[PDB]
Amino acid sequence: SHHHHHHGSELPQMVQQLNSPDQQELQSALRKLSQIASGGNEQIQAVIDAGALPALVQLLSSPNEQILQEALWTLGNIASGGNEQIQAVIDAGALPALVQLLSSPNEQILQEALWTLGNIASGGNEQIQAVIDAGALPALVQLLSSPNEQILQEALWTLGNIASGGNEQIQAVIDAGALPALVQLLSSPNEQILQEALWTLGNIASGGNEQIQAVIDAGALPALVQLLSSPNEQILQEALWTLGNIASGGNEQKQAVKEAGAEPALEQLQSSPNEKIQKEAQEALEKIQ
Amino acid sequence: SHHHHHHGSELPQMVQQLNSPDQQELQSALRKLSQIASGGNEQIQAVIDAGALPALVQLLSSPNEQILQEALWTLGNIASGGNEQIQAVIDAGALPALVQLLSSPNEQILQEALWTLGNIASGGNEQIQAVIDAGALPALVQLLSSPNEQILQEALWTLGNIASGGNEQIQAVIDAGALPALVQLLSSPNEQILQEALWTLGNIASGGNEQIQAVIDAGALPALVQLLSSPNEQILQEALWTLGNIASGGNEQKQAVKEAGAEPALEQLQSSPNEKIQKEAQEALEKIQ
Ligand SMILES: [Ca+2]
Ligand SMILES: [Ca+2]
Ligand SMILES: [Ca+2]
Ligand SMILES: [Ca+2]
Ligand SMILES: [Ca+2]
Numbered sequence A, B: 001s002h003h004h005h006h007h008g009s010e011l012p013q014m015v016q017q018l019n020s021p022d023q024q025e026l027q028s029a030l031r032k033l034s035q036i037a038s039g040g041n042e043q044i045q046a047v048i049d050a051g052a053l054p055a056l057v058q059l060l061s062s063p064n065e066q067i068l069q070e071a072l073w074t075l076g077n078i079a080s081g082g083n084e085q086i087q088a089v090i091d092a093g094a095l096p097a098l099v100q101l102l103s104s105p106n107e108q109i110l111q112e113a114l115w116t117l118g119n120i121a122s123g124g125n126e127q128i129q130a131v132i133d134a135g136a137l138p139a140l141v142q143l144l145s146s147p148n149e150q151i152l153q154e155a156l157w158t159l160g161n162i163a164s165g166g167n168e169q170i171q172a173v174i175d176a177g178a179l180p181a182l183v184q185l186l187s188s189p190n191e192q193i194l195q196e197a198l199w200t201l202g203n204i205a206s207g208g209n210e211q212i213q214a215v216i217d218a219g220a221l222p223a224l225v226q227l228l229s230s231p232n233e234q235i236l237q238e239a240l241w242t243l244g245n246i247a248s249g250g251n252e253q254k255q256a257v258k259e260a261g262a263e264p265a266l267e268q269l270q271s272s273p274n275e276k277i278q279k280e281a282q283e284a285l286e287k288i289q
């Protein structure tokens, strides 16, 4: 099922009502805009072109959480469209307000802010760079020690998105000090945390030799080889993939994987019922020959 | 809330399963892909990159409607992403298969085909031109005579989307003979149809002097002035808007609006409770001086 609607003098009136001193008129317009921004790129574009972004960004400073959550939601949805749409969010000045929100004692606000930064960081290298230049990395890395598993997964995802940019963007992640926190997380008894940390680490390990060498130095290899003993097949797959990425580096990084005791563990996984596990294990093992 | 997932050897496997002779395995994969394609641009991009498009396009020839409806749904969702994502749908050869579906006696398939086509025509001029070149216009124009209000609304939207492009693509719609059918639709007692028609016509009237003149020569002006008597405020709004578009042309187009007796009907509407109606009526009247 699908409804079509034309815009629309309503949309600017909607935008105009974000500055309205009537909070329920305000909230009604706000909910309406978030609903529209949750459609296609076409819909998202209509919200942008109606000039919603400056007003939405202003609301990120509100001491009213009801207003704020809905505005964050709207922004996050816009940032799930095209790169130029993500860019319009950045141009509107959303990033400094988003970063400031990373220190919120409100877990709902914090996760929504992280989720929105994540969406922005999911775009092109231009958009990723803006997040870094806005200064998100230090608060992001700090959140890696969070005892809150829900906040942790959200920070891991955003960091991973940042780390899927060019080699210089990955390096910014490494330089903000993400690697010791991640490596530590590889020691968790929580398989869900492991999958999340490996997603991010793997993105880092897919960089150039300098980025890969940093991963080696932070002691990721022993932890990765330990995970090759995991009964959980998702973990095996992520750990194999991360390792395969390291083993795609130079002779130096390859030699490091060889010295890490990975060959026995890989040789067993080569005889696995799981086809994905069988494959990545065979390949990882082959690259380091 | 929001769940994240890292792809994933599964995605190519799901793609590889579109060609599986196991129909339930095929359906399972198919439904999984469409679910993923209904996420952000990030998610849509993953489906494209996994190479689902060539396989999805093949399925558009299947005599199995269950398979076909789900593949259509999947393609339409991809076509609701960025311009280059639409482009990837076109580059995979979807358009000729879509246009052939416009002759389907199955209303479900037909509406989904139009919907997907509509999503493609919502992109840039480059994407719109490919729909035109694929030969969609003749069937679309024919559907304007359809006694099915549901099929009708879907054809109106897709044509409207085409008509939102450059003056040349608007011209292409005019040349396929859309204007007589639209003008006929302006005589409908069905206000829902009127709105849909006025959306399409208004888009055509936002073209250059050539395209505006074609609208005037199709006899829209009497019909539009008649609609300025409507008790329905949306209809008044769309008709005022369409008319304001015509009155944004050259002196000759403006002269024609004067000659069509729009003067007293506008002046009446200049004293109206509705602020949008008040405004567009006032402007239109001003342009034709
Ligand atoms: Ca108040
Ligand atoms: Ca408060
Ligand atoms: Ca709290
Ligand atoms: Ca992206
Ligand atoms: Ca039928």
Ligand SMILES: [Ca+2]
Residues within 6 Å of the ligand: A041, A042, A045, B122, B123, B124
């Ligand atoms: Ca568009």
Ligand SMILES: [Ca+2]
Residues within 6 Å of the ligand: B147, B148, B149
């Ligand atoms: Ca009917």
Ligand SMILES: [Ca+2]
Residues within 6 Å of the ligand: B189, B190, B191
């Ligand atoms: Ca009626």
